[PDB]
Design a protein around this ligand. Structure first.
Ligand SMILES: NCCN(CC#Cc1nc2c(N)ncnc2n1[C@@H]1O[C@H](CNC(=O)CC(=O)O)[C@@H](O)[C@H]1O)C[C@H]1O[C@@H](n2cnc3c(N)ncnc32)[C@H](O)[C@@H]1O
Ligand SMILES: NCCN(CC#Cc1nc2c(N)ncnc2n1[C@@H]1O[C@H](CNC(=O)CC(=O)O)[C@@H](O)[C@H]1O)C[C@H]1O[C@@H](n2cnc3c(N)ncnc32)[C@H](O)[C@@H]1O
Ligand SMILES: NCCN(CC#Cc1nc2c(N)ncnc2n1[C@@H]1O[C@H](CNC(=O)CC(=O)O)[C@@H](O)[C@H]1O)C[C@H]1O[C@@H](n2cnc3c(N)ncnc32)[C@H](O)[C@@H]1O
Ligand SMILES: NCCN(CC#Cc1nc2c(N)ncnc2n1[C@@H]1O[C@H](CNC(=O)CC(=O)O)[C@@H](O)[C@H]1O)C[C@H]1O[C@@H](n2cnc3c(N)ncnc32)[C@H](O)[C@@H]1O
Lengths: 262, 262, 262, 262
C-alpha cells in the first residue's frame, strides 16, 4: 500500500532508499509521505525516533520498519543487505504486527498544558541551578527528590538512557513505565528511594516543583526549556507503536545481540 | 469462618494471639489450623513467610493477614493496637481480597524434579567454589554468568533481597519476575548484561551448569544444597497469594513508609 | 591576629557574625578581609566553598573555620551555640592546623589556558548535544567516554557529588583525586571502565574532545561554558587548604554524623 | 641467582616451565624452591596468588614474575612467547623492582589470634544465617552492617572482587585498603554508608559480631570457617610484594588491556 522512507541522509542511506523506491515501483506500492501505511526508517535509532515523531498523530494507522546502516540499532530489524528481501516481503504483505507501549508526559503551566509522546524516555533536569521536585504517585506524596534529574522510560527505552542510570531492562509486552534517578543526594536530611521504580498502566507519577519552576524536559531526542511549570505528569500512554514483523527476532535476543555479543 | 493464627513466639506475639483467639470466640469463628480460610500471622515478615509456606498447598482457599509486632514488616497491614478492630472487621467479613504474583522454581537432576513456590525470591549460589551458569531465556542462550549468584524476585519481593542487589521495585499488579546479579565478573573475556531483567508471565528463564553441578538454592527463608543439578527453571507461577484487605494501604505508600519515613 | 567572617546572609548568620566580631573586639584581633590569617565562614557548605574561592590566592597564609547554621555542613566544625567558645579559643591561638588536598583543572583552548582550583570537585558536561571525550591517563589513551559527563573529586569532595555518582569515600590524608562517570553508555560498540578511578599525586588525566569542542565545566559551585576546548587536564594540586582545629573531630566520625545518624 | 618456577600444572605450563629451567641452566642460576630470590609463576592469577602465599614469609627477599598462559592475567607481565627473552633478561639482572601494598587481617577468638596476608582481598560472610557486624573505625563505632558480607581490598585487588562490588580502582602506589559492601540492607531501621570506603595506612577497621559469632573468612583464594570470633581487624600491612620489572607496563594500561580492549 502507501509507504514512505526516511533516511539518515548520508550517501549510503540515501542510495539504499532510492534503490528500495525503485524496487517498490515494481509492485502495487504508492509512495506517500502524507498518509503512509508503512514507514521505513534507514539509518540508526535516532533516525527511527525521528520517523516515529514525524507520524505520531497516525500511530494507529502505521507499521514501522527500521534498517540499520551503522552498527546494529535497537529498533532496526534489517541490515542493508536484506533490503531487496524486505521489499519483496512487504510488497506481498501478510506480515505480523507487534506493538510496544509508549509514555505520555503532560506539562502544566501557570496563568496551560502540553502533552508529549515518548518511545524511549522523558527526562527532567533543572534549567541551571539545583533540581528539587516532590514526587507524587497517584496523589500520594512519595519523596522529595534532590539531584541531577529523573528519567521515565518505556519498556523499549529501558535499554537506552534508563540502562545507563541503573534501571532494569523490561520486556515490552509489559505495559509499564520505569523511573530512574540521576545522581540523587542522600544524607542525614535528604532521602530518596534510590531504586528504579516500575509503574503499571493507569498509575500517574506527578513531579511538583519546590522552589525553581523552570525545567529542561527531554522527550526522546528533543529537549525543551519549560518555564513556570506547575506539574509534570507521567503515565503509560493508551497509544502504541506498531512494528511490521517478518521473522522472529525476540526482544531478549535483540538485547543479547546489542550488549553481549553479535 | 475457619481461621488460624501463627505467632513469632515471643511473649508479646503469643499474648496477642491468645487475646485475638479469645475475641474470635465471641463470633461465628472456628479455630482450624488444618483447613483455615483466614491465616493471621503475628510477628515480622519472616513469620509471615513461614505462614505462607505452611499453607502453600491451599493458597487458593486462604486469605492472609499480617500483624507486625516489631518495626513495620512489609507484608503486615496492622499494628498490635488495632487487633481488636481487626477481629471485629474480620468477623463480619465482606473485606476485599487482593492477589500478588508468585515465582515458580523448578530444579531438575540427573539419574528427577523438585518445584518450589516463592513469595519473595529464589536465589542460586555455588556450593563452595566458583559460580558459573549459562542463562537461557525461552531457549535462547543469553549469557554465561560468572559471579556470586543470581536472584529471581517476585514483585512483592522486589523490596527485599532484590532491592539490595540494585533491582527495580515493581508494583505487584504487574505479573512478572525480576532477575538480579550478585557480583558479576566483567572483563575482556567475561561479559554479563549487568542490568536487572524483568520477565513477563510465560517467559522461562533456565540456568544450566557449566562445570560444577552443585548449587545452594534459597526459596524465601529456606536454603538447600542441591547436588547433580541439570537445570534450574524460573517462571511466574499460575498460583497467587491472596490478602484480606480492610482499608486502603497502597503499595507505594507501603514502600514510602518502609524506606523514606514513617 | 587578622581575621574575617563571611556570612550566608540570612538574619541568623549575620547576627552571629556581628556577635563574634564584638567578642573578637575584646582581644588582639584585627578584622581584615584583604589579608586575613583566619577566615570564618558562617552558613552552610556553599558558604564555606565561597569563602575558600574568595581567598584561593592566599591559601598558604590562611586557616579556615566553618560554623554551620543549618543542618550540619560537612566543612563545618562548630554549631552556633559554641561560637563564644570558638572566639576565646581562637583568640589565644595554639590550635592545630590540618590540611586537605585540592584538585587542579587546566583548560586549554584554540587560537590559551585557564586554571581552576577545586575543594570539592570539577565536572565536565557537554554544551547541549552528546558528550564524547577521549580519556588519556599520563599520555596513555585509556577509553572513549560517551555519556552525560565526568566528575573529578578531591578526597573531601568524595562525600559530595562523587558520592551520588557511586564513587568511594576517601580519607583526606590520601593525596589523590577520583574520577566518576555520569551515565556512561555501554553496549557492543561503546565501552567504558564503569568503575570510579582513584589517581595519586603527579598522575595527569586529560580529556580530549572527539567531535564537539564546547563543554560546561563546573568547579565547586561555579559553572562556565568553555568554547573551542582542546584539552581539560586534571591533577592533584600542590596547593592545600588548611583548617584550624581546636578538638578532635575525625573524618570518619564526620562521615558517620552526616550519613548514618546524629 | 636462586629462583623457582610454579606451574598451573597443565601441559602447556609444565612444558614452558621445563623449557625455562633448561634455558636458566645456561646461566649462573640455581633452581631453589626453599630460598628463592626470584619466583616465576606460569599460569593465571590464581597460580600467581598461590605462589605469593607459598612464599609469604620471605616477601622481602623475593621478586615475583608472572607469565600468563591463558587470557591475560592481571599479575602477569609476560606471554609464553617471550619466555626466552625473559630468561635472558633475568639472567643478566639489573631489572627494576616495584612494590604493591598488602592487606593484614587479624582474627581474634574467645577462650587466641590468627593473622593473614592478602594480595587481592579479605572478605567476611556469615556461616549460614544473617550476617550482622558492627563496623568500628579507629575505635569509633561507624555503622551496623546487615547484608551478605564485606570485602576489604588492596590496591591491586581493586580490579578483582572489589570491582564487581562497585568499588573504585586505585593505583597501587597509594598505600590504602578499600571496604565494599555485599548487598547491604537499607530501610527505615537499618542503615549503612553504601559507598565504598578507602582507608590510609595506620587506620584500623574492626568488625565486631552482634549475634552470631561464626564467620566464613576468605583471604585471596582461601576460605576458612572461623568459630567464636570476637573481632576481625583490617589494616594496611607493613609488608609489601615486590615484582621484577623489565619494561614499562603502567598500571592504567594494564587496566585498559584487561577491561577495555587488547
Ligand atoms: N543521535 C543520538 C540520539 N539518541 C538516539 C537513540 C537511541 C537509542 N535508543 C536505544 C534503545 N531503545 N535501546 C538501546 N540503544 C538505544 N539507542 C542507542 O543509543 C545511542 C544514541 N545515543 C547517544 O549516543 C547519546 C546521545 O545522543 O546523547 C546509539 O547507540 C543508539 O543505537 C537519543 C537517545 O539517546 C539516549 N541517551 C541520551 N543520553 C544517554 C546516556 N547518557 N546513556 C545512554 N543513552 C543515552 C536516550 O535514550 C535518547 O532517547
Ligand atoms: N529472619 C529474616 C528472614 N527474612 C525474612 C524477611 C523479609 C522481608 N521481606 C521483605 C519485603 N518483601 N520487602 C521489604 N522488606 C522485607 N523483608 C525484611 O527484610 C528483613 C529480614 N531479612 C534480613 O534481615 C536478612 C536475613 O535474614 O538474611 C526484615 O527487615 C524484614 O522486614 C528472609 C528474607 O531476607 C531477605 N534477605 C536476605 N539477604 C538479604 C540481603 N542481603 N539484603 C536484603 N534482604 C535480604 C530475602 O528477601 C529473604 O526472603
Ligand atoms: N548551594 C549548594 C551548592 N553546593 C554546596 C555544597 C556542598 C557540599 N559539599 C559537601 C561535601 N564535601 N561532603 C558532603 N556534603 C557536602 N555538601 C552538601 O551538599 C548539599 C549542597 N548541594 C546541593 O544541594 C546540590 C546543588 O546545589 O546542586 C548540602 O547538603 C551541602 O551540605 C555545591 C556542591 O553541590 C554538590 N552537588 C551538585 N550536584 C550534586 C548531586 N547531584 N549530588 C550530590 N551533590 C551534588 C557538588 O559537590 C557541589 O560542589
Ligand atoms: N581460580 C580463581 C580464583 N581467583 C584467582 C584470581 C584472580 C584475579 N585477581 C585479579 C586482579 N587483581 N585484577 C583483575 N582480575 C583479577 N583476577 C581474575 O579473576 C578471575 C578469577 N576469579 C574467578 O573467576 C572467580 C572465582 O574463582 O570465584 C580470573 O579472570 C583472574 O584473572 C581468586 C580471586 O577471585 C576473585 N573473585 C571471587 N569472586 C569474585 C566475583 N564475584 N567477582 C570478581 N572476582 C571475584 C577474588 O578477587 C579472589 O581473590
Amino acid at each position: 500500500m502507501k509507504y514512505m522512507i526516511t533516511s539518515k541522509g548520508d550517501e549510503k542511506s540515501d542510495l539504499l532508499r532510492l534503490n528500495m523506491i525503485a524496487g517498490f515501483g515494481e509492485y502495487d506500492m504508492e509512495y506517500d509521505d502524507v498518509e503512509p501505511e508503512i514507514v521505513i526508517s534507514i539509518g540508526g535509532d535516532g533516525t527511527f525516533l525521528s520517523a516515529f515523531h514525524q507520524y505520531e498523530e497516525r500511530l494507529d494507522e502505521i507499521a514501522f520498519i527500521g534498517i540499520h546502516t551503522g552498527h546494529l540499532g535497537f529498533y532496526a530489524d534489517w541490515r542493508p543487505a536484506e533490503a531487496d528481501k524486505l521489499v519483496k516481503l512487504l510488497a506481498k504483505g501478510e506480515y505480523q504486527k507487534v506493538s510496544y507501549p509508549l509514555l505520555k508526559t503532560t506539562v502544566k503551566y501557570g496563568i496551560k498544558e502540553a502533552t508529549y509522546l515518548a518511545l524511549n524516555e522523558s527526562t527532567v533536569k533543572s534549567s541551571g541551578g539545583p533540581f528539587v521536585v516532590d514526587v507524587v504517585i497517584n496523589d500520594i506524596h512519595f519523596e522529595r527528590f534532590r539531584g541531577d534529574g529523573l528519567c521515565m522510560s518505556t519498556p523499549s527505552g529501558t535499554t537506552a538512557y534508563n540502562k545507563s542510570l541503573g534501571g532494569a531492562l523490561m520486556h515490552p509486552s509489559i505495559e509499564a513505565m520505569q523511573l530512574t534517578e540521576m545522581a540523587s543526594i542522600n544524607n542525614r536530611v535528604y532521602r530518596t528511594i534510590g531504586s528504579p521504580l516500575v509503574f503499571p498502566k493507569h498509575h500517574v507519577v506527578s513531579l511538583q516543583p519546590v522552589n525553581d519552576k523552570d525545567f529542561q524536559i527531554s522527550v526522546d531526542h528533543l529537549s525543551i526549556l519549560h518555564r513556570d511549570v506547575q506539574e509534570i505528569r507521567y503515565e503509560v500512554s493508551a497509544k502504541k507503536i506498531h512494528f511490521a514483523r517478518f521473522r522472529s527476532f525476540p526482544f531478549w535476543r535483540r538485547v543479547h545481540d546489542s550488549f553481549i555479543e553479535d
